[PDB]
Design an enzyme around this catalytic site. Structure first.
Site, mmCIF file in Angstrom:
data_model
loop_
_atom_site.group_PDB
_atom_site.id
_atom_site.type_symbol
_atom_site.label_atom_id
_atom_site.label_comp_id
_atom_site.label_asym_id
_atom_site.label_seq_id
_atom_site.Cartn_x
_atom_site.Cartn_y
_atom_site.Cartn_z
ATOM 1 N N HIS A 61 0.813 -1.222 0.000
ATOM 2 C CA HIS A 61 0.000 0.000 0.000
ATOM 3 C C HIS A 61 0.847 1.272 0.000
ATOM 4 C CE1 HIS A 61 0.485 -1.025 4.322
ATOM 5 N NE2 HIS A 61 0.568 0.289 4.452
ATOM 6 N N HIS A 91 7.208 6.402 6.064
ATOM 7 C CA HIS A 91 6.476 6.135 4.840
ATOM 8 C C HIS A 91 5.726 7.417 4.471
ATOM 9 C CE1 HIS A 91 3.712 5.301 8.154
ATOM 10 N NE2 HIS A 91 2.824 5.909 7.373
ATOM 11 N N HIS A 93 1.977 8.933 2.373
ATOM 12 C CA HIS A 93 0.667 8.839 1.762
ATOM 13 C C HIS A 93 0.581 9.943 0.702
ATOM 14 C CE1 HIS A 93 -0.688 6.343 5.284
ATOM 15 N NE2 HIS A 93 0.216 7.095 5.891
ATOM 16 N N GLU A 103 -3.266 12.972 4.790
ATOM 17 C CA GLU A 103 -4.242 12.356 5.680
ATOM 18 C C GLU A 103 -4.813 13.429 6.602
ATOM 19 O OE1 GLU A 103 -2.385 8.607 7.178
ATOM 20 O OE2 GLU A 103 -3.778 7.751 5.723
ATOM 21 N N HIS A 116 5.198 10.254 7.309
ATOM 22 C CA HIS A 116 4.992 9.770 8.664
ATOM 23 C C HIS A 116 6.283 9.106 9.142
ATOM 24 C CE1 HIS A 116 0.360 9.625 8.061
ATOM 25 N NE2 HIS A 116 0.782 10.827 8.432
ATOM 26 N N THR A 195 -3.340 5.181 11.043
ATOM 27 C CA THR A 195 -4.322 5.489 10.003
ATOM 28 C C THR A 195 -4.484 4.357 8.995
ATOM 29 O OG1 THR A 195 -2.762 6.392 8.494
ATOM 30 C CG2 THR A 195 -3.630 7.945 10.099
HETATM 31 N N1 LIG Z 1 0.073 5.790 9.090
HETATM 32 S S1 LIG Z 1 0.637 5.688 10.459
HETATM 33 O O1 LIG Z 1 1.761 6.573 10.609
HETATM 34 O O2 LIG Z 1 -0.495 5.761 11.379
HETATM 35 C C1 LIG Z 1 1.341 4.072 10.602
HETATM 36 C C2 LIG Z 1 1.445 3.249 9.490
HETATM 37 C C3 LIG Z 1 2.007 1.988 9.656
HETATM 38 C C4 LIG Z 1 2.462 1.538 10.903
HETATM 39 C C5 LIG Z 1 2.361 2.353 12.013
HETATM 40 C C6 LIG Z 1 1.795 3.617 11.834
HETATM 41 CL CL1 LIG Z 1 1.693 4.598 13.259
HETATM 42 N N2 LIG Z 1 3.032 0.261 11.078
HETATM 43 C C7 LIG Z 1 3.347 -0.491 9.866
HETATM 44 C C8 LIG Z 1 3.840 -1.930 10.081
HETATM 45 CL CL2 LIG Z 1 4.241 -2.635 8.501
HETATM 46 CL CL3 LIG Z 1 5.330 -1.881 11.052
HETATM 47 N N3 LIG Z 1 2.349 -0.358 8.843
HETATM 48 S S2 LIG Z 1 2.112 0.985 8.202
HETATM 49 O O3 LIG Z 1 0.840 0.938 7.521
HETATM 50 O O4 LIG Z 1 3.331 1.432 7.546
HETATM 51 ZN ZN LIG Z 2 -0.668 -3.210 2.376
HETATM 52 ZN ZN LIG Z 3 1.096 6.824 7.657
#
Ligand SMILES: NS(=O)(=O)c1cc2c(cc1Cl)N[C@@H](C(Cl)Cl)NS2(=O)=O
Ligand SMILES: [Zn+2]
Ligand SMILES: [Zn+2]
Length: 256
Positions: A61, A91, A93, A103, A116, A195
């Site tokens: 994603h 990462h 968005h 977001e 983020h 999110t």
């Molecule tokens: N979008 S966000 O910053 O709330 C977010 C996203 C992911 C998180 C944690 C957070 Cl706090 N963990 C990961 C795992 Cl693959 Cl480790 N997934 S994510 O969607 O990048």
């Molecule tokens: Zn995914």
């Molecule tokens: Zn994020």
């Protein structure tokens, strides 16, 4: 199955993740005229001087830039936070057009994208324990607008080619996340959630006021990534953002 499409989009997440309709979901609209300065907020400490990036991964994603969090090499402290929070990954968005992709929104304004930087509360020992707690995580959020290129981002942009499809990863060492910060560390802060599913309500959000500028060419390379796996039909990776959620019983504080 969750994603950002019509049949598996944010509108659908509650079915498999009932907390999506929770009391402290993210992101949110930041109404600047309702946020309150809080002079009790200590200054924010971003200490990334010894940050150790390892790898970049297309997770189906977005793409994560992952860091070694085995020690206190890169940390977030102060501001609204108690204790030390270790950087584990960042990462983005982003949108299909410059008019959307963030977001969080500011007075309903949508930026082209949002960065983020995810951190976990070291008193809980690991990330998994951390997302069992109401203060487990701190995310530093930074808006992206399209203008001049962000030199600090170009390295990321140039490896995208190699992680075009889901589950692809590439070596990504010696990247300095300081190059993605704006000048000012003025922020808004509120208690929220992941999110993305599973939407756990474990995050202290710290959203910088000052966006960074990136070029259209840079963001264009984000939109050439794929949601799909290799050999599969191309679905471009765009609009991977969750819209603003109800603020409910929450106050957003301003550091300025
Ligand atoms: N979008 S966000 O910053 O709330 C977010 C996203 C992911 C998180 C944690 C957070 Cl706090 N963990 C990961 C795992 Cl693959 Cl480790 N997934 S994510 O969607 O990048
Ligand atoms: Zn995914
Ligand atoms: Zn994020």
């Amino acid at each position: 199955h969750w994603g950002y499409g019509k049949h598996n989009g944010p509108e659908h997440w509650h079915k498999d993740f009932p907390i999506a309709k929770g009391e402290r979901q993210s992101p949110v609209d930041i109404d600047t005229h309702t946020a309150k300065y809080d002079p009790s907020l200590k200054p924010l400490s971003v200490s990334y001087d010894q940050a150790t990036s390892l790898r970049i991964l297309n997770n189906g994603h977005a793409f994560n830039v992952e860091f070694d969090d085995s020690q206190d090499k890169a940390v977030l402290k102060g501001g609204p936070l108690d204790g030390t929070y270790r950087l584990i990954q960042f990462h983005f968005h982003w949108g299909s057009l410059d008019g959307q992709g963030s977001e969080h929104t500011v007075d309903k304004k949508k930026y082209a994208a949002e960065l983020h930087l995810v951190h976990w509360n070291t008193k809980y020992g690991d990330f998994g324990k951390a997302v069992q707690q109401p203060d487990g995580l701190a995310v530093l959020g930074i808006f992206l607008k399209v203008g001049s290129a962000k030199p600090g981002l170009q390295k990321v942009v140039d490896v995208l080619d190699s992680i075009k499809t889901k589950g692809k990863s590439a070596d990504f060492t010696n990247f300095d996340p300081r190059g993605l910060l704006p000048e000012s560390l003025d922020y808004w802060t509120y208690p929220g959630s992941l999110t993305t599913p599973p939407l756990l309500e474990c995050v202290t959000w710290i959203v910088l006021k000052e966006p960074i500028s990136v070029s259209s060419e840079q963001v264009l390379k984000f939109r050439k990534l794929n949601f799909n796996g290799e050999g599969e039909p191309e679905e471009l990776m765009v609009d991977n953002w969750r819209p603003a959620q109800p603020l409910k019983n929450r106050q957003i504080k301003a550091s300025f």
